[PDB]
Nucleic acid binder design. Sequence first.
RNA 1: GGGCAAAACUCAACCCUACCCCGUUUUAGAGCUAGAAAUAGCAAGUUAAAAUAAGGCUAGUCCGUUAUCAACUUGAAAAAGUG
DNA 2: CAATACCAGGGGTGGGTTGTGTATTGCT
DNA 3: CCTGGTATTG
Length: 1332
Amino acid sequence: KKYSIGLAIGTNSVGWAVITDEYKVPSKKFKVLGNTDRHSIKKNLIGALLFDSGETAEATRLKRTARRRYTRRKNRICYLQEIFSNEMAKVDDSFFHRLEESFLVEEDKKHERHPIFGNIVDEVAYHEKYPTIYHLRKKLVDSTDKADLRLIYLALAHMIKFRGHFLIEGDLNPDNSDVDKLFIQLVQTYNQLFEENPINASGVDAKAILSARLSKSRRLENLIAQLPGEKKNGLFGNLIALSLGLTPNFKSNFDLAEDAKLQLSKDTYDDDLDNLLAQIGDQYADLFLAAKNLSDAILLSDILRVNTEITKAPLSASMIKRYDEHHQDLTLLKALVRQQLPEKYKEIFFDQSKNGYAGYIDGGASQEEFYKFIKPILEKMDGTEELLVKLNREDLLRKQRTFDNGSIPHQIHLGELHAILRRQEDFYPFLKDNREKIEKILTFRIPYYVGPLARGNSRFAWMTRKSEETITPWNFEEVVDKGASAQSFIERMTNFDKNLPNEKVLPKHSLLYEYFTVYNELTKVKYVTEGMRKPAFLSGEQKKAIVDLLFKTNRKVTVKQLKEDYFKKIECFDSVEISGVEDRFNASLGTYHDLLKIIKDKDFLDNEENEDILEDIVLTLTLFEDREMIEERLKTYAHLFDDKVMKQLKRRRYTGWGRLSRKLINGIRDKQSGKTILDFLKSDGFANRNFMQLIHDDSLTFKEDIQKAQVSGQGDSLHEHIANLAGSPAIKKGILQTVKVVDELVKVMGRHKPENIVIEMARENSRERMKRIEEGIKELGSQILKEHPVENTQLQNEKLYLYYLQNGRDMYVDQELDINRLSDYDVDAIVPQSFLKDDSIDNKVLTRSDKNRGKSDNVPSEEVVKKMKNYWRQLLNAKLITQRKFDNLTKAERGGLSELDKAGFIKRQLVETRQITKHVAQILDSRMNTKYDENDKLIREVKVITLKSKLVSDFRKDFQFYKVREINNYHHAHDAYLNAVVGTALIKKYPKLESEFVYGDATAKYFFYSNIMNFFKTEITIRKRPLIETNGETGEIVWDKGRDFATVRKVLSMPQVNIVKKTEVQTGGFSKESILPKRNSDKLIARKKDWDPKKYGGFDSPTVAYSVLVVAKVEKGKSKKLKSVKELLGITIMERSSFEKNPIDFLEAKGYKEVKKDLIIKLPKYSLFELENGRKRMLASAGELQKGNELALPSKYVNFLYLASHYEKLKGSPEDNEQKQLFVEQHKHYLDEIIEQISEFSKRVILADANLDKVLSAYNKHRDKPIREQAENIIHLFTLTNLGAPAAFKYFDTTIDRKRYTSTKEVLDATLIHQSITGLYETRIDLSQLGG
RNA sequence: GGGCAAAACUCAACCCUACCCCGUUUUAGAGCUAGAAAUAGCAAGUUAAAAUAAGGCUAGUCCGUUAUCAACUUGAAAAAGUG
DNA sequence: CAATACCAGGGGTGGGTTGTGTATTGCT
DNA sequence: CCTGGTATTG
Ligand SMILES: [K+]
Ligand SMILES: [K+]
Ligand SMILES: [K+]
Ligand SMILES: [K+]
Ligand SMILES: [K+]
Ligand SMILES: [K+]
Ligand SMILES: [K+]
Ligand SMILES: [K+]
Ligand SMILES: [K+]
Ligand SMILES: [K+]
Ligand SMILES: [Mg+2]
Ligand SMILES: [Mg+2]
């Protein structure tokens, strides 16, 4: 017979269905294997495979990087110790041993328990002298005396082990370190530019004001308030704001045209500033330079909170200041508490559980938690004003190793280390000879372009070696072929040209590439004037003239410039009409202008002889971000430029890559013409062919060479092909499961390929939205965050999120919005919900009243646009509002929405265009249709139809085949069945639609695509449609409105649906990552081989990879008498390899004896067992079970629950709304009935006596509640019966905690069921037959 | 119209390298006084070492948490096969 | 033995890719 | 968050 397949692909489920030409679901007798008495079973050909979500490779990669980092840090310490080996041997022959075994307890220590000095007196004396490591570091930096080699090692090792970040390149340039010295020089330069309006900085304490621990805006205010007649938005105020790290706008200071927002931290900044400089010149260059220097000094004084006069170890001195102030403040706080709150001293200083000082030090309290706990204690006390201020500045009782130490650059640690080396090399000759080695150990970092230093056993590595010896930081340049390794980095990184697959893609900012884009756009530009009959192309001379006169003198070329600056000036046209370009030219020559500003040699740029050198320069600037490598590759061109241009160029940086190779653009030439693609793009007579026309023109060579070039390589497997698809790994796991389901379904139907396969794909935090708001107000320069504090979780509500996105302003009315009145306010859809279902914040907007939007059918009225356009663009620059949202807000000025707009919105709602769905369709099509005809065209025996969820959702809502997701998992299978039905019927009714729905090769649309699915309806908003629905041409019947609806209903009401939870071996981390303290418990796992957890603590809570059923004997009692057992042993992920290498030895080491090797059953997670009365359990672990049954609630109750709970929308037909409400009230008794159907189920399968009794009491409690709320809570009640892991749920206000199945003893005598992917093929094993 | 390409603006999803900072764990940093002793009173507290998936062989300044997996007949395996 | 309350490593820096809609020029 | 491990508690 003939049949079709319906599929619903999700992130966790693949629903599948088989239908006949009558839209019926077949049933079949399937053979049952095993050792049970049942040999076959009847099954319906509907079901749904369920699985756990597929995970990305991000967490694995981060674990891998942390692993490599720990390894290499240990290697750094090893290098330092090998350097110190021979002399430390003379000083202390067991020092490094004591350091290595510092973790062991004294019982296991092979040496003295005191690490540094091997005796208690010297150790205690050391600690008294240096309370922290930073004391010793500063001392070794400053003191002139010879020091103990062990203390030198400790200081250098602490500097190398925690060496600081690498965000700053080169040396730190410590001549401009003082904030006052740079602020005074900034005042000098500013007064230089303005002799008439100077600023007197006398008595201005810039050090205290600018280095204070306050917000940047507050420090700006405090500095400006010290300058009378000067304001914060003046030029000097904006310069100070730029130095503090803010985003000033210099547009108003220089009477500019548009925004000149600067910020030193943005990567664009350089360009930005130089852009700005073009407006006013180079007089202000060194002014902004002085501002940047002042900013660097402030960034340093943020870290080096100590003056640099007395010491050369400012970091260690700042740490010592922390320690001393902590000591003073702690002494004072204890004295104060003894004075006024001696009742609370012990809780504060002895209680670790409380967030006092004790928990802050010994417990688990954090600095923030400690501040919150002790702030009211300080406020209630007297004499704590200084301590209170210190708390508010986040600077009280501070430790030295804190979270904010991440801003410390490595050059600071390097300065202190180099100072110690200089001091102590006068006494230790090996320190003098190895100074640069020890410095290298701190500075050297494996380059980003080299990767893992592997030797042929790493799938991540790509490095090649000049010689075959061990790589150290010192011999790196001699062992590693940096040239070939960087070349391989390039090859691994860059995409290939698709037309020429053996050629690399040009950089996105290549001069040749932007020339290509400009000429390709400019070629298809036509123009017309009065004395012209027809618009004409530009000639080659015209195009070269427009390039030389406009594209090489202005970064952007506007149509206005094209008309006035070219056609008026050269062609003498008073008027002209341009076509092919609107507003401005998308393409431009930005790289040309960059290199023009840098090299200052327009002739050098315009010489065809310099094409190769400039291309290589741009390539080098795009490949790398490393200063060393960039400097290295531009040395061949060092003779052509001076040092100033060379430095400017070294700073020039680019990212991104094009999509075409250079051999395609200006390499291959037409055989006849001898011209390249770019040659035609510059001049093609009057034809003016562009890139597409140039590679698709049979008249010229290119197409032939392209076809000669392309190669279809060695084909991927199915799994490989799916993996290489663009998309999330979850949906790709779903796709692979879909293909396997389809394979097995074809196998079930006697290997007969179906006629149709309908596929549907489901379309489907706090920190990122808080980040949006945080950056948005920062850019806006507003203070609403200051006025209204809000936590990240509070943004679960969408109204508050929209509010803080809108800066207190109303989006349709220029009026402030009230925080406390947020209840009344209205969330409106920019493009309305009637036309588009976009419930995202992108089509959402918070306003005082919906009315103020203007009319509803169109986009907000032109008046509202004219009003709020500036505020909308300001929110767009702050990125609080996206460009899509902005364009939708202002569409009225462009005419609102056209008829084509609405028609296309509908068509996109109905036709799927998502690429991943097309890829799945391609895979299924290429697997089903494999033969060719006499014309060698593909034989499409199977048709792959693709649907969007709105079709079947609307079908359910129209004909009341409602879905309730929380009842069971049948809705996936039902979605698949309805997909098959609707797709098949739709393409039967309208074959012309195949173009839109099958894979392979005025206002009319608004009515057509909105009425395509009306042939199911009997009545219409007039004419009654025929009860029988046929194809107009073939006459074949497509839909019987008297029977096929009944068929769909009978199919949806079927209780037997093949729901299969995919059994899976667990993978990932061995256990919880927490390192637990020591404890007397055999659940603790040692973190090292010899670290007994009873002494050293360790891990617990491992993940079971899979359980194993063991039938064996164990020793019982002192006599060790063998007693027979049959139990579940969970093999952990960590034990899995050793178990699989030899299971017998593994089990015997566990204590089992005489193991029946052939009765060992591997049981992954979710293994299915059946017990009595059809009760089913799934394996959640070796010692816990999940619910294994589905509640097949009758369709009547599903529809009643949908309607009574107001599950989605109300029908919108007032008569029909009253119809449905009357049905709900007439069938109210269903409530009780539903409960009964649950109770019975729970009594037969769930077996939670206490939970069921509490649920029944709760249901009887709220019997006078409205029907809608009782139904909405009955919807929750299905958590008790849902398949899978138990969960807690609320019925009204009563909470029902999950009942767990903490024992797997019963499944050992149950029936184990092995199901195929559809669950149609089974193997049933009676486990009670094993053991004895 | 369906598929496709490049440019412009855009946001979502993914893949990879080199590093940084905390956290946790054990040990070290002589607790004192009064008691037989339980215990009570006070003193102190900020730091470091070392581990940071057990570990593996290929012994690399490498690898170790992604993807893939019902059962059965083969095969050592990858694979094929069975209702 | 089974019921049950508690708990689960976090933050930052670089690069590359496909796909998303909007609209320009085009191929097929 | 979800859901399985874990110690408490009878
Ligand atoms: K991390
Ligand atoms: K010992
Ligand atoms: K002032
Ligand atoms: K703490
Ligand atoms: K444009
Ligand atoms: K770069
Ligand atoms: K896995
Ligand atoms: K997993
Ligand atoms: K299975
Ligand atoms: K893109
Ligand atoms: Mg390790
Ligand atoms: Mg630490």
